[PDB]
UniProtKB/Swiss-Prot annotation, chain A:
It comes from Escherichia coli (strain K12). The keyword Hydrolase applies. Transmembrane segments: none annotated. The holoenzyme may undergo conformational shifts upon DNA binding: the nuclease domain of RecB may swing away from the DNA exit tunnel in RecC. When Chi DNA binds to the RecC tunnel, the nuclease domain may then swing back to its original position (that seen in crystal structures), allowing it to nick the DNA 3' of the Chi site and then rotate to load RecA. At high Mg(2+) the nuclease domain may swing back more frequently, explaining differences seen in assays performed at high Mg(2+). This is RecBCD enzyme subunit RecC. GO terms for molecular function: ATP binding; DNA binding; DNA helicase activity; exodeoxyribonuclease V activity. The chain holds residues 126 to 811 of 1122 of the full protein. After reacting with DNA bearing a Chi site the holoenzyme is disassembled and loses exonuclease activity, DNA unwinding and Chi-directed DNA cleavage; RecB remains complexed with ssDNA, which may prevent holoenzyme reassembly. High levels of Mg(2+) (13 mM MgCl(2+)) or incubation with DNase allow holoenzyme reassembly, suggesting it is DNA bound to RecB that prevents reassembly. Changing residue 8 to A: Does not act at Chi. Belongs to the RecC family. Disruption phenotype: Decreased degradation of DNA with free ends that is unable to undergo homologous recombination, which can fortuitously lead to more efficient viral infection. Cells are deficient in DNA recombination repair and have increased sensitivity to UV light. The cultures have many inviable cells. Cells can be transformed with retron Ec48-containing plasmids. Heterotrimer of RecB, RecC and RecD. All subunits contribute to DNA-binding. Interacts with YgbT (Cas1). (Microbial infection) Lambda virus GamS protein interacts with the enzyme without displacing any of the subunits.
Curated annotation (Swiss-Prot), chain C:
Coiled coil: none annotated. Heterotrimer of RecB, RecC and RecD. All subunits contribute to DNA-binding. The C-terminus interacts with RecA. Interacts with YgbT (Cas1). A helicase/nuclease that prepares dsDNA breaks (DSB) for recombinational DNA repair. Binds to DSBs and unwinds DNA via a rapid (>1 kb/second) and highly processive (>30 kb) ATP-dependent bidirectional helicase. Unwinds dsDNA until it encounters a Chi (crossover hotspot instigator, 5'-GCTGGTGG-3') sequence from the 3' direction. Cuts ssDNA a few nucleotides 3' to Chi site, by nicking one strand or switching the strand degraded (depending on the reaction conditions). The properties and activities of the enzyme are changed at Chi. Belongs to the helicase family. UvrD subfamily. It comes from Escherichia coli (strain K12). The chain holds residues 640 to 738 of 1180 of the full protein. Disruption phenotype: Decreased degradation of DNA with free ends that is unable to undergo homologous recombination, which can fortuitously lead to more efficient viral infection. Cells are deficient in DNA recombination repair and have increased sensitivity to UV light. The cultures have many inviable cells. Cells cannot be transformed with retron Ec48-containing plasmids. In the RecBCD complex, RecB has a slow 3'-5' helicase, an exonuclease activity and loads RecA onto ssDNA, RecD has a fast 5'-3' helicase activity while RecC stimulates the ATPase and processivity of the RecB helicase and contributes to recognition of the Chi site. This is RecBCD enzyme subunit RecB. It comes from the Bacteria. The gene is recB.
UniProtKB/Swiss-Prot annotation, chain D:
It comes from Escherichia coli (strain K12). One of its GO terms (molecular function) is ATP binding. GO terms for biological process: DNA damage response; DNA recombination; double-strand break repair via homologous recombination; recombinational repair. This is RecBCD enzyme subunit RecD. The gene is recD. In isolated subunit ATPase and 5'-3' helicase activity are inhibited by non-hydrolyzable ATP analogs and EDTA. After reacting with DNA bearing a Chi site the holoenzyme is disassembled and loses exonuclease activity, DNA unwinding and Chi-directed DNA cleavage; RecB remains complexed with ssDNA, which may prevent holoenzyme reassembly. High levels of Mg(2+) (13 mM MgCl(2+)) or incubation with DNase allow holoenzyme reassembly, suggesting it is DNA bound to RecB that prevents reassembly. Belongs to the RecD family. It holds the Pfam family UvrD_C_2. PANTHER family: DNA HELICASE B, DNA2/NAM7 HELICASE FAMILY MEMBER.
Length: 686, 260, 99, 593
């Protein structure tokens, strides 16, 4: 566990901190760095020295790029083997090391950076008061007219750039809070000396509430009325008028995840009906964790009637092909530590492949369920297994006691008497007792493997074990050959990494078993993403696809954003830099990407009240900051002059809709704006 | 009180999907049969270097990584040399003669189909110009509109003429001459590989038309090559390889059919 | 004929899951409407839908349909007591005396 | 040890996993002679053999070459009795031991209690029922018109009435059912005021319904009053239903505690009664109940491993005791022959054989030399018997050609699109019977060649339309049992196999709902017992193998109602007639004591 967590930091130290490892390679220490950095410099120094003893190549991502930039700094314009032109598309976050290598690469290969930013002006930070002179360069437009920061040289001093840090006001407060990622990124793009930047921006004509916000973020203006003075605090007409018929930005309060998605299925039908051209492919639904909502997404979309049915595709879901084959094999690797409870061995017979190898039919397993129960098979398999756990040896209630009790009953009737002090089991005297012979051949194979898996073996001795265990315990079929091949592929790749790293010490089986559980679940499948059914998947950083309808689920406070704490001894979190990436800033910038990506309607849903105890919940701070900016910058046509706060909460209550607790609630079927398309509960509501 | 539930009038959705040719159809013989042995046979030629001969230490480590024993490698490194040295079509192109500059391995193409593709509206054009489409009934698939997917095993150019290559193994029970000009084409009609190379050519034709400036079909196209791994033998050059060139009048009407 | 409709329920059971099959069973038999008509039947219906949610939860983890029935029978013998397995509050109880 | 050596037998498929694991647990760590001796015992007991005599295990001429691994273990001690009895896994019957060694035959305690219960019930616990000989003779005189000659049917009725337990042996078509009606009629007429409770039983529901209809036609030929017709039994049920055998468990509702409530019990086709069912039936019988068994000595089910009736009628060839021959002479009013010597008194007096019936002349010549067999199949042709010499494969194809002629009427009715009920009766007009299971001649051999002959000829194209199917194993849920036939056709609701219930109603079953099914165009001679077939054909291999036996060919000829055909070699068929089935059961050894 320590060797894996440290290898993850050295990898991050390679990318984002090449100068550190450069100082640790010589043995010197960095001045002004967080504690625990002491013992880490030798562990990297020894690592470079140990990999040198093994003869492996010394070059690595840290020390390599500096010579790579230097060899491309002075050289001929035509190095061999390099492509004509390279494209960078969709990536809004890059470390400074990569941009330094791409800057020196621009002298030969033409690189085009495709970068989506919400603001057409410069919202980035500033280094020094003399650094803005280099940021005064023009930005070329398709109109060939040069573009510069707004207000020209007046906004530089202004209140915008303040003290020694970056921009203060940053225009729209939504971009300043959420856009902390793109801040440093656009700051690194404008730092390139030889880069030629040109902008093409399509102006969004504000009409709907959605186009109003995308405007304010694009033009970089604050439309929220703070009410600094009582003259401004009174009249509410100075805000932007909001139409009551606008469905663009809506917020929905639900009870449980079930009822939440079931309401989403009704609102998606209302959006498909209200427009002549709407493709379910163009509609996306993003969830905090797709694995928690996956059973509910599949249920409501699979239970819809024919005319009501719409195609759906779940993505980013953890790829699982055959569930029992993977789970039983992991349980088979626990044989040396297994107590061999009767229910566990019968759970191994639940897999049809494990029963097919021993040819135990499904109709015959029902006889084994009653026989194991009545013959007194409970505790571990053998008597030696009992003493191995340091429990007193009994001789009864074991798989050997039960089998012998069952085999003795086949030969001799229970009415005769005891023989070894084991009473014969009379239930099977006939041809049905043949299944006892097949069950007895299973425990023999379980006794052989549990004794072989207990001893620690070098990595080269663990290679055949997976191939020998699969064919012995399983009889492959057309369906399970794919999953069993993925087992041998992942199992042998782990040992190939161990043999490739020259590890000659013996390893216990408990280490490789837990390593299989981690690497096997991390596999996912993106194949069904764009296939054209409605897209369901978790929010993925750096992935932004413009869509007409964008939905959001699981916005409850503490669920989003996704909280990943640093290792706590990591030095990068102590002294942050520009290009440092944190999962908190990734999800906060993802909520901004999802806001600009929606071209028509935006769907945000969260659980306001827990359906169990009927308590109060809260939406994520990102959603809370959004509904606060909507109410302050807009007013309803009913009252053009009321008050700043009174019209605020009036707009926030109008966009927020509270759906009922149960699907049969008659409130859903009342004629109006929100009406459920489910006809199954229509007679129940009546 | 009175209540009602809204009912959708228009269809809930139409068919827009991204599917491959699999969504449409829906001694070398002693080698094991299945999906795992087939993927291993393909994995060989994936990273294989054609110009350099076969190294026995490389074959031993590939079967070791795949889980197979040393019983194979002596029978493999030989058979592999017989596949790379086999001449192809009329020009007698050997696989070892291809430089890495002309090699393109595992091409993934996306071919959009605009109007909905109807089975009967297709096979009639197919069976018209294609003699291989006479056998078997017409292809049966639901109306599909969207992007088409596919994986090209190998694409290479020789003498300024591009070619198309694909790998098939299968054939659990046959070893000897049962792979022949009549029998190989008989299985091509059985597994419906006819449409497969016809869709692969339309793909490659559009890619060569897009990438190459001033491209012509008849000039730069060398035809289709279907390489059967287990059918390659040192005795018979014809066994194991299958070569057919589209009529050039079929792709012209096919490209117009998929465009509109 | 009942064997025919129960066979059709088994088909939807295999192709979809527990929740869609119980939805089709309640829609065809019209038991959801009949329970709301019976006095104290809405409390009965809230438990049926909540179990259908837990069976859909445990149905995604276990692909084997018989292991799903064994999971349900195992939880029936010994109550799990989990908070998510606790009985939900009936609707309209806001207007009822709270003990 | 011999453990790993026994693990090869599983891959060699010479032993089941039940036999190997039973051998490791019971014998344990003792000499490998005791381990393999329980291994071959569990194997023979699995195939149905009752015991394992020590002389067969010692001789190298035995099967399972794993036996040749015993010379490296047992070291040629030449004493199997001293080695086995010394271990705790084998005893003389005093201790509660799994295996029992008594008469040089080693076998399980289960088979030991079943052999002891059956052999004792026939030797002991049976009482000679004394009734008036004058009145009993007057009743039999009114049933049987001809008193001038000795009537075997009259002795069969006299022996069954005078003795509690009795067996009436005879071939098919010899008038067995008619003799039972005379026995039941004379039984009800004997006791006017005493309660008479009669029960009809068969191992299979097929022959059970065959017993009810045949007993019904024979009983209406005799006059009876309303009280006698009130005591006439209603219908017959399966022996498992009579004992109340549960489908799930092995328990019985009767056993020792609850006796069957009866006066007399008639079990038809006792040949299919294996030793377990005979021993389970004996403890269920009260002390006042008389039981009568029906069957033949030469039926293959009687000589099969685990059978009872085969060794019981083996002593019937000796004849009646000297005293009973005088007693039966005073009863039947004729001269009853006396058997020479005294072997077993109680057993020989409880048995009777009916010798009065081309089918009958051939079957009677089977027990005699091959000179009468070859002469009977040859001259005059009998119109019921034909012979085709089969050596080369060209005569093997002509065999399949006449095989189509027998199914000619059946194949047409399939292609004529008839109703299932008539076609079920039509498939009983022809059947194919073959000795071996596998090879060029056998169940596995013919079914492939026959269906290939159905591909070459266009009669039926291939579950295929019009296919006959038989059930391999019993099913309690669907009401169909092993040895029953069905016809699969599309009535327009779907493709379904149809069966004929004993009540006459048709029962549709989906093809996936059948527990077990197989191609019935050829049947195993043992599986066709109890069924009737209008035309039949026997298929015997050109190879010489002990599998072909006398009782197998006998049950093939007796399986045909009227028409019969044969394809066999005169050298192979006649030589197989001389060879008879060897039985290892120690029942006949206890009767000699």
């Amino acid at each position: 566990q320590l060797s894996s967590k440290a290898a993850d930091l050295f990898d991050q130290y390679l990318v984002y901190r090449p100068d550190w490892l450069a100082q640790w390679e010589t043995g010197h220490l960095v001045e002004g760095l967080g504690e625990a950095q002491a013992w880490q410099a030798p562990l990297w120094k020894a690592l470079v020295e140990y990999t040198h003893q093994l003869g492996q190549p010394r070059w690595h991502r840290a020390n390599l790029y500096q010579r790579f930039i230097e060899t491309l700094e002075s050289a001929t314009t035509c190095p061999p083997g390099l492509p004509s032109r390279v494209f960078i598309c969709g990536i809004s976050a890059l470390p400074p090391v990569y941009l330094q290598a791409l800057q020196a690469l621009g002298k030969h290969i033409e690189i085009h950076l495709l970068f989506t930013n919400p603001c057409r002006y410069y919202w980035g930070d500033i280094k020094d008061p003399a650094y803005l002179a280099k940021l005064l360069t023009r930005q070329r437009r398709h109109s060939f007219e040069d573009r510069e920061l707004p207000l020209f040289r007046d906004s530089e001093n202004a209140g915008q750039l303040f003290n020694s840090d970056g921009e203060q006001d940053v225009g729209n407060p939504l971009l300043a809070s959420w856009g902390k990622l793109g801040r440093d990124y656009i700051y690194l793009l404008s730092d390139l000396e030889s880069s030629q930047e040109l902008d093409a921006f399509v102006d969004v004509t504000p009409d709907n509430l959605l186009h109003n916000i995308q405007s304010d973020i694009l033009e970089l203006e604050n439309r929220a009325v703070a009410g600094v003075n009582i003259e401004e605090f009174s009249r509410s007409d100075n805000k932007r008028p909001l139409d009551p018929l606008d469905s663009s930005i809506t917020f929905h309060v639900c009870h449980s995840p079930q009822r939440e998605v079931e309401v989403l299925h009704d609102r998606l039908l209302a959006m498909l009906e209200e427009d002549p051209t709407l493709t379910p492919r163009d509609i996306i639904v993003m969830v905090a964790d797709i694995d928690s909502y996956s059973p509910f997404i599949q249920a409501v979309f699979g239970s819809a009637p024919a005319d009501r049915y719409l195609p759906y595709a779940i993505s980013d879901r953890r790829a699982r092909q055959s569930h029992p084959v993977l789970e039983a094999f992991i349980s088979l690797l626990s044989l040396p530590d297994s107590r061999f409870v009767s229910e566990d061995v019968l759970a191994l017979l639940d897999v049809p492949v494990l029963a097919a190898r021993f040819d135990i039919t499904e109709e015959g397993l029902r006889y084994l369920r009653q026989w194991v129960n009545e013959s007194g098979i409970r505790w571990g398999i053998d008597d030696d297994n009992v003493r191995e756990l340091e429990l007193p040896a009994t001789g009864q209630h074991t798989w050997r006691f039960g089998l012998t009790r069952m085999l003795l009953g086949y030969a001799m009737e229970s009415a005769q008497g005891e023989w070894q002090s084991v009473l014969p089991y009379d239930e099977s005297s006939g041809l049905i007792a043949e299944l006892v012979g097949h069950l007895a051949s299973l425990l023999m194979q379980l006794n052989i493997w549990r004794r072989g898996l207990a001893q620690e073996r070098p990595l080269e001795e663990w290679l055949p074990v997976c191939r020998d265990m699969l064919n012995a315990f399983f009889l492959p079929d057309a369906e399970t050959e794919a999953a069993m091949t993925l087992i041998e592929q992942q199992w042998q790749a782990i040992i190939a990494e161990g043999l490739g790293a020259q590890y000659g010490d013996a390893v216990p089986l408990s280490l490789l078993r837990d390593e299989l559980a981690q690497r096997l679940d991390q596999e996912r499948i993106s194949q069904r993403f764009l296939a054209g059914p409605v897209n369901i998947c978790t929010l993925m950083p750096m992935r932004s696809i413009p869509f007409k309808v964008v939905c959001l689920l699981g916005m409850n406070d503490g669920v989003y954003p996704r909280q990943l704490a640093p290792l706590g001894f990591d030095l990068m979190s102590q002294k942050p830099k520009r290009g440092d990436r944190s999962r908190r800033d990734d999800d906060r910038y993802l909520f901004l990407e999802a806001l600009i990506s929606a071209q028509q309607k935006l769907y945000i849903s969260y659980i306001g009240r827990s359906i169990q105890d009927n308590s109060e919940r809260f939406p994520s701070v990102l959603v809370q900051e959004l509904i606060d900016y909507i109410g302050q910058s807009h007013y309803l046509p009913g009252d053009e002059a009321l008050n700043c706060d009174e019209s605020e909460a009036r707009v926030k209550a109008h966009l927020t809709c509270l759906h009922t607790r149960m699907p049969f609630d008659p409130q859903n079927y009342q004629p109006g704006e929100r009406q459920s398309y489910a006809r199954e509960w229509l007679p129940a509501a009546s | 009180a009175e209540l009602n539930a809204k009912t959708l009038q228009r269809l809930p959705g139409d068919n827009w999907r991204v599917t491959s040719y699999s969504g449409l159809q829906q001694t070398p013989h002693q080698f094991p049969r299945g999906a795992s042995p087939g993927t291993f046979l393909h994995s060989l030629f994936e990273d294989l270097d054609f110009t350099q001969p076969v190294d026995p230490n490389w074959v031993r480590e590939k079967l070791e990584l795949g889980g197979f024993e040393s019983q194979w490698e002596p029978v493999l490194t030989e058979w592999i040399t017989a596949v790379l040295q086999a001449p192809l079509n009329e020009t007698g192109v050997s696989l070892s003669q291809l430089s890495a500059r002309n090699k393109q391995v595992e091409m993934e193409f996306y071919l959009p189909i605009s109007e909905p593709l109807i089975a009967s509206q297709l096979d009639t054009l197919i069976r018209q110009f294609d003699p291989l489409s006479a056998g078997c009934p017409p292809l049966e698939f639901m109306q599909v509109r969207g992007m088409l997917k596919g994986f090209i095993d190998l694409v290479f150019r020789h003498e300024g003429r591009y070619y198309l290559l694909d790998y098939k193994s299968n054939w659990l029970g046959e070893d000897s001459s049962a792979y022949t000009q009549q029998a190989m084409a008989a299985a091509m009609q059985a597994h419906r590989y006819d449409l497969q190379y016809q869709l692969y050519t339309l793909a490659l034709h559009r890619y060569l038309r897009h990438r190459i400036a001033d491209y012509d079909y008849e000039h730069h196209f060398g035809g289709v090559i279907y390489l059967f791994l287990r059918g390659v033998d040192k005795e018979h050059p014809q066994q194991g390889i299958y070569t057919t060139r589209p009529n050039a009048g079929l792709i012209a009407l096919m490209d117009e059919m998929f465009a509109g | 004929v009942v064997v025919e409709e129960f066979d059709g329920y088994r088909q939807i059971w295999r192709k979809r899951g527990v929740m869609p099959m119980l939805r089709a069973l309640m829609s065809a038999r019209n038991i959801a409407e009949n329970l709301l008509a019976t006095a104290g039947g809405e409390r009965r219906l809230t438990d049926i839908l909540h179990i259908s949610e837990l069976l859909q939860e445990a149905g995604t983890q276990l692909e084997s349909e018989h292991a799903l029935v064994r999971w349900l029978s195992q939880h029936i013998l010994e109550p799990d007591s989990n908070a998510s397995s606790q009985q939900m509050r009936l609707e309209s109880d806001k207007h009822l005396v709270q003990i | 040890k011999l453990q790993k050596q026994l693990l090869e037998a599983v891959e060699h498929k010479q032993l089941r996993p039940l036999d190997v694991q039973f051998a490791l647990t019971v014998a344990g760590d003792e000499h490998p002679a005791v381990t393999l001796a329980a291994a071959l015992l569990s194997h023979d007991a699995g195939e149905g053999h009752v015991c394992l005599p020590l002389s067969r295990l010692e001789n190298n001429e035995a099967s399972h070459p794993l036996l040749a691994t015993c010379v490296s273990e047992i070291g040629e001690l030449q004493n199997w009795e001293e080695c086995l009895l010394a271990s705790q896994a084998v005893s003389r019957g005093d201790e509660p031991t799994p295996m029992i060694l008594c008469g040089d035959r080693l076998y399980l305690n289960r088979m030991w209690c079943n052999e002891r219960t059956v052999a004792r019930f026939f030797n002991e616990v049976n009482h000679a029922i004394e009734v008036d000989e004058a009145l009993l003779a007057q009743t039999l005189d009114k049933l049987f018109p001809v008193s001038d000659e000795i009537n075997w049917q009259k002795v069969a009725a006299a022996v069954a009435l005078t003795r509690r337990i009795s067996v009436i042996s005879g071939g098919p078509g010899t008038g067995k059912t008619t003799t039972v009606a005379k026995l039941l009629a004379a039984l009800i007429q004997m006791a006017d005021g005493e309660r008479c409770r009669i029960r009809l039983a068969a191992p299979t529901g097929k022959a059970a319904a065959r017993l009810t209809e045949s007993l019904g036609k024979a009983l209406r030929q005799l006059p009876l009053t309303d009280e006698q017709k009130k005591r006439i039994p209603e219908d017959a049920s399966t022996l498992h239903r009579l004992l109340g055998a549960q489908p799930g468990s092995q328990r019985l509702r009767h056993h020792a505690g609850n006796p069957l409530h009866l006066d007399v019990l008639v079990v038809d086709e006792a040949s299919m009664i294996d030793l377990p069912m005979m021993s389970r039936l004996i403890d269920a019988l009260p002390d006042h109940a008389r039981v009568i068994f029906l069957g033949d000595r030469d039926q293959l089910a009687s000589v099969e491993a685990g059978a009872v009736l085969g060794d019981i009628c083996a002593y019937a060839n000796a004849g009646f005791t000297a005293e009973r021959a005088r007693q039966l002479s005073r009863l039947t009013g004729t001269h009853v022959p006396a058997g020479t010597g005294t072997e077993a008194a109680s057993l020989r007096d409880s048995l009777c054989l009916l010798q009065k019936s081309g089918i009958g002349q051939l079957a009677a010549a089977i027990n005699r030399g091959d000179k009468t067999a070859v002469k009977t199949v040859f001259q005059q042709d009998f119109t019921d018997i034909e012979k085709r010499l089969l050596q080369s494969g060209e005569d093997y194809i002509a065999m399949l050609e006449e095989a189509l002629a027998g199914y000619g009427r059946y194949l047409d009715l399939l292609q004529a699109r008839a109703e299932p009920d008539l076609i079920i009766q039509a498939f009983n007009e022809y059947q194919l019977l073959c000795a071996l299971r596998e090879g060029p001649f056998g169940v596995a051999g013919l079914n492939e060649r026959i269906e290939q002959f159905m591909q070459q000829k266009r009669k039926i194209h291939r579950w295929y339309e019009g296919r006959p199917v038989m059930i391999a194993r019993n099913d309690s849920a669907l009401g169909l049992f092993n040895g029953d036939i069905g016809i699969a056709l599309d009535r327009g609701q779907g493709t379904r196999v149809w069966f004929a219930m004993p009540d006459g109603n048709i029962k549709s079953v989906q093809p996936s709902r059948l527990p077990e099914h197989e191609t019935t165009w050829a049947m195993t001679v043992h599986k066709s017992q109890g069924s009737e077939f209008d035309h039949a054909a026997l298929i015997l291999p050109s190879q010489r193998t002990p599998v072909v036996t006398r009782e197998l060919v006998y049950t093939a000829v007796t399986r045909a109602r009227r028409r019969l055909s044969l394809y066999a070699d005169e050298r192979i068929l006649s030589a197989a007639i001389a060879t008879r089935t060897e039985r290892r059961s120690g029942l006949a050894a206890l009767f000699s004591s």
